[PDB]
Amino acid sequence: AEELLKRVEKLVKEAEELLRQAMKKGSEELLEVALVVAQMAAREAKKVLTMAEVEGDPEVALRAVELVVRVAELLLRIALVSGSEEALERALRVAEEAARLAKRVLELAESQGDPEVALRAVELVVRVAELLLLIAKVSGSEEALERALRVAEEAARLAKRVLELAEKQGDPAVAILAVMLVKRVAELLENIARESGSEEAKERAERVREEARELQERVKELKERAG
Amino acid sequence: AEELLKRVEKLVKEAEELLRQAMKKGSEELLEVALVVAQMAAREAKKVLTMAEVEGDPEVALRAVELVVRVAELLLRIALVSGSEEALERALRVAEEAARLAKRVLELAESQGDPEVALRAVELVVRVAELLLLIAKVSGSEEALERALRVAEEAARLAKRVLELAEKQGDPAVAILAVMLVKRVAELLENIARESGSEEAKERAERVREEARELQERVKELKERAG
Amino acid sequence: AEELLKRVEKLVKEAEELLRQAMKKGSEELLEVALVVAQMAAREAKKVLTMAEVEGDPEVALRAVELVVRVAELLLRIALVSGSEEALERALRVAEEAARLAKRVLELAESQGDPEVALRAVELVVRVAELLLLIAKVSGSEEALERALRVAEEAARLAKRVLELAEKQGDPAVAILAVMLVKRVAELLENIARESGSEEAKERAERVREEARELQERVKELKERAG
Amino acid sequence: AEELLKRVEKLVKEAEELLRQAMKKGSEELLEVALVVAQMAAREAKKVLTMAEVEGDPEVALRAVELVVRVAELLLRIALVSGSEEALERALRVAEEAARLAKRVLELAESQGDPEVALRAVELVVRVAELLLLIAKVSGSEEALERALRVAEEAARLAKRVLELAEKQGDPAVAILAVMLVKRVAELLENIARESGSEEAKERAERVREEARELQERVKELKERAG
Amino acid sequence: AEELLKRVEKLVKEAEELLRQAMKKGSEELLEVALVVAQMAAREAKKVLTMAEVEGDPEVALRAVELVVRVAELLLRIALVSGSEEALERALRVAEEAARLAKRVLELAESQGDPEVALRAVELVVRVAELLLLIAKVSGSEEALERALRVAEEAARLAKRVLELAEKQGDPAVAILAVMLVKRVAELLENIARESGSEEAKERAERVREEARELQERVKELKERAG
Amino acid sequence: AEELLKRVEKLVKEAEELLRQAMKKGSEELLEVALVVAQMAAREAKKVLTMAEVEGDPEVALRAVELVVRVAELLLRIALVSGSEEALERALRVAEEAARLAKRVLELAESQGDPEVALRAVELVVRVAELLLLIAKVSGSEEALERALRVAEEAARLAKRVLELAEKQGDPAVAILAVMLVKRVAELLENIARESGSEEAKERAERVREEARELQERVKELKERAG
Amino acid sequence: AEELLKRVEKLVKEAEELLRQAMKKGSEELLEVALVVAQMAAREAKKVLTMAEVEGDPEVALRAVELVVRVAELLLRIALVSGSEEALERALRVAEEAARLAKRVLELAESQGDPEVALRAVELVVRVAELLLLIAKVSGSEEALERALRVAEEAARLAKRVLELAEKQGDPAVAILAVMLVKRVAELLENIARESGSEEAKERAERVREEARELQERVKELKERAG
């Protein structure tokens, strides 16, 4: 549904340009609009995922959910520039719901057998953990730290499906990178566990970083299978 | 009709470059040309609006009438540099006719249901009020002040169609900005009423500035509808 | 008679391409040709309607009269680019005669019982009202405004046959849209009555816009009949 | 015979691309090839005209002889880049023979009664006069000027058949343009007669330019016949 | 043929940079190269005019012949810095041939109907008269003064075609400037006639300066036609 | 089998883009992937040659084997950036096997009689000699120099089939270029024989460069046959 | 590979700025870094030559090897400021290897037929002879004098390829300068032979300076060929 795709995609450039009008001038009226424009983008964007999730058109969703994250990037800047604790909690819920929408996408492609669409989608989730991480360091709360914590470790589980998805096809392309994301996660699990000091995060962290060390073994053979 | 669009658009850059040749040298022969070049741009530009107004190609007109205003910006500088009271009255009529061409555009898109093309078009009118305002302060006349006065308050009425146009679609994008333009007008109605002292302008001014205060209420709900 | 169809259809692309040769260069010799090419298209196009009106081949006519309107779109641009008051009155008569040719088509299909061919044909008439509307705003005359006025309100009567035609078949497809066209007309009756201020147009306008409000009731049941 | 059409058409793009490899590098080996590739295109192209001239498939020839001219455009550039007086005389004979091939095409369509195929074919001849004109200004010779002179004035006679061909069908489409070509010729007859000063060319020139003035009269009625 | 355009354009910057290496150091070996580089630019530049003169690509030539003049500017500086009477007579012939190449360009666009490409091309010729004027004051000869004299008064005739070319299109853009060039010439015809004292130059001068006074009348109406 | 073609073609752009991610960052994990992605491209690419070699679809293979070489270009850069002597010997075997795949292609088209598909395929081999040449200068070994030596001189033999293939069809297109490739080889045979000093390479070199001198004679007539 | 180009280019400005921090302060820790930074630039720079030598992107290498020399300029200053005989022998080997990298570049462009890239590359070698010359006068050794001697006289041979490369294209641009470099060398062969007194250097010197006297003859005609 390219008609919806461009129109939603169009909203980004307007609001993202409205952002710069505010940086020059500092008018909340410009900013109120952004919380109207982008916050209705989620309405129409999520629909594009829906009708796309019907026909089995996976590439559309990857180019859509990625755009939802850009909203989170935008709504973040608003709350940073404005300081509204609501706007954090606006961008929070939007960002958190992106997790579901990502997980909504993953199990699609297995029915399609198209793994490559996953891996770029999975990495979107990872930035959200990085994204909330910036938010948690602002408020200092542990609520969001847990939200971050549950997202990524849940996101870590997802790669095992992906690694399982590749070994069906025997495709190394998605295979090796899938492992690397976990190392790209291990930076996070470290960094939150650096701060809060909860050994559970460290426990969670060690298991994850230890898992990729183990998971790479399943690809060490695949590097010898096809090449 | 891109062929016409670029050719008219081309004339601007030539004459606007001829302007700078005159600023360096001060030759009226360079300037006589500008009153030939740009004054024929209105001939061909208005045609681009016409044939575009047929097919229902709205975005072309917005990119066209905007260029007509640039002529007014140019013809203004001529009369400022030259001092010809005619050239004021040249740029006056051209500028005043832009109002009709703008109003000619507005009711188009309602048949198309494409509101966003309006709002940038409406704002073109507003500069013309600012534009004549500079002219009225030059001549000191009240004729042009009335022309300015009738344009903007007529232009103020237009947003109510726009606000009405959005509430059909429920689009907040054009909605909120539409209100803000009236505040962007209220500066004008103030400033002319600062000078001439006619309480009618102040009356006109208060009603307008009081209207946006009221009109925003219709969007306060729309901010709660979709988000 | 596909042989005639393509040959007439072919003329459009030539002249419509000749149009663009003129926009680049501005040669009336290119334009004289257009008033020869397209103005003979009406000769041969109207014949295609005739011989098609014999056998009861309705779909041919819809694909033909639609092409006559394209001529009106073309001849319009000529008179806009050229400014010949004759060419207005050329495109006027051609356009006005399209009304008869449309009305000539409508009562055909009732003998055939094929309603869907009507509705797209009816909408062609509506653009002609929009088409003359552009012409009337050029000349400013009230003659053409009346021609516009008599066409559409006569065209408004036609839908009642269509609505009557559907209720025979009980087809909702043509049914609901038929109502919507009247609202698509009400924009027109408003807009001409905005300008000329004749309360008769407003009276005509109110009755029409009030009629669709009433006519939809006859479909509200049909929405409950079949679904 | 589309198989031949594309294969000959294919040769153009190769050699025309080989041309650009030479412009970057300046290798005569690239250029020797062009005098092999395109010079065999005339062999196979002329055949496509032949077998097409059998069945009475006129549109094929128009799309073929037009491609022969492109060779002349290419072979010209070679002789310009190279400077070989032979390559002029190569491109000369090829170009001159195109005249016959054009005249070979014209009398075909009268048997078919398909005039429109002529007019675009006739205009191909006219460029050849323009084409040789560039060559004559290079060598400065009067031989080619006469070749140019005899081609076009012979080509001028051809339109009278075309004008006669239309008046059978009463088609204005080919009719009016046919006149315009003579004016498009009159530029040539002027320009050669500007240079060489031979009053015969001027005499030839006046008669031609005076002829179109007279020939248009036969179409002035046709503009009143059908429209 | 952009490949040729940049490569020739590239040569300018090299040699024009080699010029500055010589100004710092004073090595004729640097300067011998310039008479090799630029003097082969005319070879390849003139070709770009040729192959461009084929297809009817006028804007290329204007951007090419302008570059030929830059060579004349460069070769001039060489002969000034060096003092070689040959290098004068080198730059002379190159410069004089530019006149033909300019006149070669002018009659092109009338076939294209693209006047604006002329006027900037015509002005290139005018600098050559100014260019030779500097040379004639160096040698003091009257040969070059006549060459200068015949160029410009021949160049003065050209504008009448241009003025005639515009009145076809009714374009004032090229129209008014065309007149001004003659006044831009009248400075020259004065200045050579100041020096040599030949009343013929003064006669030539008066007629020219009197001509523009008359020619402007044909544009005084055009300033009233379109505007 | 376009499905396979794009998918293999797709892998190139990914890995070739992964290459640039490594150049910015220097992660071997990015590079390990390239030796997985592209090294499986040879698996699926060679299959596309196979199933294409069945039906007699030659143009597919030319667009396929060309892509295999791009892998060699990529794998080369890896070993250069990384320095792994294995990766040389990886890219070596892949590159050497491309020779067979090229030779596998050549004798196909003779059964099809389609020579032009050969010549671009033959030139792919030639770059491989250039390709290994870069590798041999890295390791300094003479093994690869012999591999290079045997490839090209074997590749030189191939043109004789091609020259023989053309003389059947009498096509000069492939004919002349075929000779030129040998001169394009003679640079190589020189350059390796410049370095290693083995007179056998020089002997091999002289015979080859002397052969084209002789082989051109067979085309000198063909330049006189068709033209 | 612009990513590598800037990053290597970036290292220069850092280290070259670190150089100035040392000149102000005199810290070997600043200088140890330079022998780390620039000495790894050769690692990555030489790679840029490699991957560029693959695709046939010559202009990249000229802009790369030139930067290698700048390192030699920097490493020189270090050994001068520091006095480390190793750092001489560091900068020596780096500088000497630049000769190969230059010679590696030269034979590239002949396959490309792009001579101008050579001449600026050749001149880089010449500075290295000047560069080692400064080093030899420091140590007083004759080893480096021979290295200098073998480089330049080998570098002198290279121009004969270049002169041969131009005469293919007939380009005088690279042609004349190529001769001048030998005279730019003859200063060197003099100056080393001034000092060491070895008649072989003088013999080498005379032959070289006598060669350019002879080689210019081959260009004296080329100055008469094209101009």
Query: Helix, strand or coil for residue B193?
Result: helix
In the block, which residue shows the tokens 């600043």?
G30
* Residues of chain A neighbouring B173 (CB-CB closer than 8 A): 11, 14, 33, 36-37
Q: Which residues of D touch E55 (CB under 8 A)?
A: 73
Residue with tokens 């191939």: F158
D63 touches chain E (CB under 8 A): no
How many whole angstroms separate alpha carbon A84 and alpha carbon A70? Answer: 19
Report residue D43 CA to chain centroid gap: 18
Subunits in contact with chain F (3 or more CB pairs closer than 8 Å):
A, D, G
Q: Contact G110/F187, CB-based, under 8 Å?
A: yes
Partner residue opposite B226 with nearest CB, options A11, A33, A43: A43
Quick one: how far is CA D133 from the chain centroid? 13
**Segment holding C170, helix H or strand E:** none
Among chain B residues, the shortest Cα distance to E216 is held by B29
Classified as helix, coil or strand, F115 is coil
Chains that touch G (3 or more CB pairs under 8 A): D, E, F
A36 within 8 A of B172, measured Cβ to Cβ: yes
The Cβ-side half-sphere exposure at C205, using a 13 Å CA radius, reads 19
- Tell me whether A37 touches chain B (CB under 8 Å): yes
E107 class by beta-carbon count within 10 Å (0-12 exposed, 13-18 middle, 19+ buried) = middle
For residue D136, give both structure tokens: 């004559």
In the structure encoding, which two tokens stand for residue C135, read together?
């012409």
Q: How far apart are CA A145 and CA A200, in angstroms?
A: 12
D-facing residues of C in 6-25 (CB < 8 A) are 11, 14
Query: Is the separation of the CB atoms in A226 and F45 below 8 Å?
Result: no
DSSP secondary structure string for all residues of C117-168? HHHHHHHHHHHHHHHHHHHHHHH--SHHHHHHHHHHHHHHHHHHHHHHHHHH
Q: What is the DSSP letter of C177?
A: H
- Do chains G and B touch by CB distance (3+ pairs < 8 Å)? no
Any residues with CB less than 8 A from the CB of G137 and at least 6 apart, and which? G195
Find the closest chain G residue to E30 by CA distance: G177
D124, D37, D43, D140: which is closest to D88 by C-alpha? D140
Selected residue of B11, B33, B89 to mutate for chain E interface (largest E Cβ count, 10 A): B33
Q: How many CA atoms lie within 13 A of B39 on its CB side?
A: 22
CB F91 within 8 A of CB F134: no
A179 contacts A212 by C-beta, under 8 angstroms: yes
CB E152 within 8 A of CB E209: no
The answer to whether C120 and C64 have CB atoms below 8 angstroms apart is no
D176 contact residues in C (CB cutoff 8 A)? 29, 32-33, 36
Cβ within 8 Å, pair C36-D226: yes
Out of E4, E54, E111, the one facing D134 most closely (by C-beta) is E54
Q: At what angle do helices E28-55 and E85-112 cross, to 10 degrees?
A: 20
- Give the 3-state secondary structure of residue F56: coil
Contact between chain A and chain B (3 or more Cβ pairs less than 8 Å apart): yes
Cβ atoms of D122 and D166 closer than 8 Å: no
What are the backbone dihedrals phi and psi of residue B148, each rounded to the nearest 5 degrees, phi first?
A: -55, -45
Cβ burial, residue G65 (10 Å; 0-12/13-18/19+): buried
Answer yes or no: are the C-beta atoms of C112 and C61 closer than 8 Å.
no
The two three-digit tokens of residue F87, written as one number: 């990766």
d(CA E224, CA E215): 15
Q: Within its chain, how far is the Cα of C75 from the centroid?
A: 15
Q: Cα–Cα distance between E136 and B86 in angstroms, integer?
A: 48
Q: Which helix (H) or strand (E) holds D155?
A: helix D143-169
Torsion angle of C-alpha atoms A211, A216, A218, A220, degrees rounded to 10 = -160
C18 neighbors C34 (Cβ within 8 angstroms)? yes
Q: How many CB atoms lie within 10 A of CB G53?
A: 22
Could you give the count of Cα atoms lying within 13 Å of C8 in the half-sphere of its Cβ? Answer: 27
The amino acid at residue G66 is: E
Who contacts E182 (Cβ-Cβ below 8 Å, separation ≥6)? E156, E159, E208, E209, E211, E212, E215
The sign one gets for the Cα dihedral B45, B51, B55, B56 is positive
Optimal mutation site among E8, E36, E86, interface G, most CBs of chain G within 10 A: E36
Count CB atoms within 10 A of the CB of residue D97.
Answer: 15
What is d(CA D2, CA D8) in angstroms, rounded to the nearest whole number?
10
CA distance D174 to chain F (A): 37
The alpha-helical segments, DSSP class H, found in chain B are: 2-25, 28-55, 58-82, 85-112, 116-139, 143-169, 172-196, 199-215, 217-225
Q: Which chains touch D (3 or more CB pairs under 8 A)?
A: C, E, F, G
- Give the gyration radius of chain A's Cα atoms: 19
Q: Which residue of C has its CA nearest to E112?
A: C25
DSSP annotation of C142: S
F80, F137, F187 ranked by CB distance to G51: nearest: F80
Single-letter amino acid code for the residue at F121: A
Residue C64 near residue C12 (C-beta atoms within 8 A)? no
Structure tokens at G133: 């010359």
First CA to last CA across chain D, in angstroms? Answer: 37
Q: How far apart are CA C130 and CA C142, in angstroms?
A: 15
Q: Which of D23, D75, D190 to mutate to test the interface with E (most CBs of E within 10 A)?
A: D23
Choose among C149, C113, C111, C114: nearest CA to C129. Answer: C149
Residues ending a continuous segment of chain B before a break (C–N > 2.5 Å): none
Query: Under a CB-based contact definition with an 8 Å cutoff, are residues C14 and C37 in contact?
Result: yes
Q: Other C-beta atoms within 10 Å of D82: how many? A: 18
Interface contact D37-F177, CB threshold 8 A: no
What is the distance between the alpha carbons of residues D223 and D217, in angstroms, rounded to a whole number?
A: 10
3-class SS of residue F170: coil
Contact (Cβ atoms closer than 8 angstroms) between residue E91 and residue E70: no
Burial of E217: CB neighbours in 10 Å, binned 0-12, 13-18, 19+: exposed
DSSP string, E168-212: HHT-HHHHHHHHHHHHHHHHHHHHHHHHH--HHHHHHHHHHHHHH
Quote the minimal CA–CA distance from E83 to chain D in Å: 34
Rounded to a whole number, what is the distance in Å from the CA of E41 to chain B's nearest CA?
30
Question: To which residue do tokens 């630039």 refer?
Answer: G41
In the structure encoding, which two tokens stand for residue E163, read together? Answer: 């003025």
F36 and A177 in contact by Cβ < 8 A? no
CA distance, residue D20 to nearest chain G CA (Å): 15
Interface of G with D in 109-128 (CB under 8 A): 113
**Structure token pair of residue B4:** 């016409």
Resolution in A for the shown PDB structure? 4.3
Helix (H) or strand (E) holding G171: none
Give dist(CA B70, CA B42) in Å, integer.
Answer: 11
The per-residue b/e assignment along E27-46, b for 16 or more CB within 10 angstroms, e otherwise, is eeebbbbbbbbbbbbbebbb
Backbone dihedral region for residue D141 (phi beyond 0: left; psi -120 to 50: alpha; all else: beta): beta
Closest Cα to residue B144, out of B128, B130, B156, B133? B133
Query: Looking at this protein, which amino acid is placed at residue G70?
Result: R
Residues E71 and E31 sit within 8 Å (Cβ to Cβ):
no
- Nearest to B56, CA basis, from C187, E210, A18: C187
- Chain E contact for G176 (CB, 8 A cutoff): yes
Q: Which residue of E has its CA nearest to B27?
A: E180
Q: Which residue has the tokens 């399209």?
A: C98
Distance CA D191, CA D129 (A): 11
Mutate to test the interface with D, among F59, F223, F225 (most CBs of D within 10 A): F223
| CA distance to D78, F110, F120, F157, F174, per residue, from F165 (Å) | 28, 7, 15, 13, 9
Q: Which tokens is C55 given?
A: 């056998």
- C109 burial (CB, 10 Å; 0-12 / 13-18 / 19+) is buried
d(CA F185, CA F179): 10
Nearest-angstrom CA–CA distance, D43 and E15: 46
User: F35 — contact with chain A (CB < 8 Å)?
Assistant: yes
Q: How far apart are CA F100 and CA F96, in angstroms?
A: 7
d(CA C153, CA D1): 56
Q: Which method was it determined by?
A: cryo-EM
Please check whether residue A131 is in contact with residue A187, taking contact to mean a CB–CB distance below 8 angstroms: no
Cβ distance B35 to B78 under 8 Å? Answer: yes
What would the two tokens of residue C67 be?
Answer: 């092409």
Contacts across the A-B interface (CB distance below 8 Å): 28
Read off the DSSP letter of residue E142: S
The residue assigned the tokens 């891109």 is B2
> Which residues does chain F have within 8 Å of residue D14's beta carbon, measured at their own beta carbons?
173
CB-closest option in F20, F134, F184 to G53: F134
Distance of CA D120 to the CA centre of its chain: 9
Single out the residue of F185, F113, F216, F167 nearest to residue D32, CA to CA. Answer: F216
Residue D1 carries which DSSP code?
Answer: -
Question: Out of E11, E14, E39, whose CB is closest to G227?
Answer: E39
- From CA C210, how far away is CA A189, in angstroms rounded? 67
Q: Name the phi and psi angles at E171, rounded to 5.
A: -80, 120
Tell whether B180 is within 8 A of chain E (Cβ): no
Q: Which amino acid is at D190?
A: E
Q: Do C33 and D223 touch (CB under 8 A)?
A: no
Under a CB-based contact definition with an 8 Å cutoff, are residues E82 and E26 in contact? no
CA D69 to chain centre: 7
Structure tokens of A51? 């009708």
Of B124, B119, B142, give the one whose Cα is nearest residue B197.
B142
- The first and second tokens of residue A107, run together, are 């199990």
Core vs surface per residue C44-63: b (16+ CB within 10 A) or e:
ebbebbeebbeeeebebbbe
Q: What is the dihedral of CA A166, A167, A170, A175, to 10 degrees?
A: 50
E222, closest residue in chain B (CA to CA):
B36
Q: What is the DSSP letter of C57?
A: -
Beta strands in chain D (DSSP E): none
Q: Do C and A share at least 3 CB pairs under 8 Å?
A: no
